[PDB]
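Predict fold of Bifunctional ligase/repressor BirA; 290 aa.
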Amino acid sequence: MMNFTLLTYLADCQPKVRSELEKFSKNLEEDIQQLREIGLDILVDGQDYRLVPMLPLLNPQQISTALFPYSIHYQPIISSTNEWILQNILSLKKGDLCVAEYQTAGQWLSPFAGQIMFSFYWAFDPKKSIEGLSLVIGLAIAEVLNVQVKWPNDILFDERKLGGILVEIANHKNGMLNLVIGIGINVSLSKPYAEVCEIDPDVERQTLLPKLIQHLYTRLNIFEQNGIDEEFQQAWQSYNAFSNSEINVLTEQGVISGIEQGIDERGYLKVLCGNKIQMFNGGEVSLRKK
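Predicted 3D structure, encoded as tokens:
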């Protein structure tokens, strides 16, 4: 069982003596070791216990001044960035974000401060359709990092997953379509996955996070107008790593083989299997390469 309070107190990544630490944990050394097992690195030098970040910690006010006017909440340790946006939905506007260094619920040995992890609140017209939204989120991320996309919502470098996207619908009666979009991008992971450190060795999470968020909001606004138009489908093809490739579509009824044929106006995957094009929805099916 993870000691959440101990992790939160150690989150500043500054040294803390056991006299204070013994308050948050009862059997302390058993809990420090349990945190070490889940991939966190707590090093005790002499009498000083310190948590080690994989990358330099983020500065909240630097992000806030860079992403004005969007309101930013920074928590070093949180259960879920999506839950905070959901739980505080009544106090937020478009683009308000919850950025964290570690998510306790969610890689397995995921590192503290090794990922760009943020969630944000977005609203659409209640009539509007969100079909293809996860494709817009992925394409924006791929364009910023000059990497590839995989349908429906995978970001790829060297055919390896560089991050993940989670789009959720809030059960709030705003008269609008309320969505929490969650993003995790691997920057430096301790080690079938990829990290931005490979593509850009001198990358800094402080600069990349506003860059990604700004382009993401552009494409979301483009989606509100253009939809999944022909220009978007051309943009998808440019960054698709599975374009016109021999693919296997894993479905609840088994695997359908064929050749990838891009996307339609609803964001559905188009595959040529036999002599007909078969279309699939993202949540129901999974994409792989023969």
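The chain has three domains: 4-51, 60-237, 242-289.
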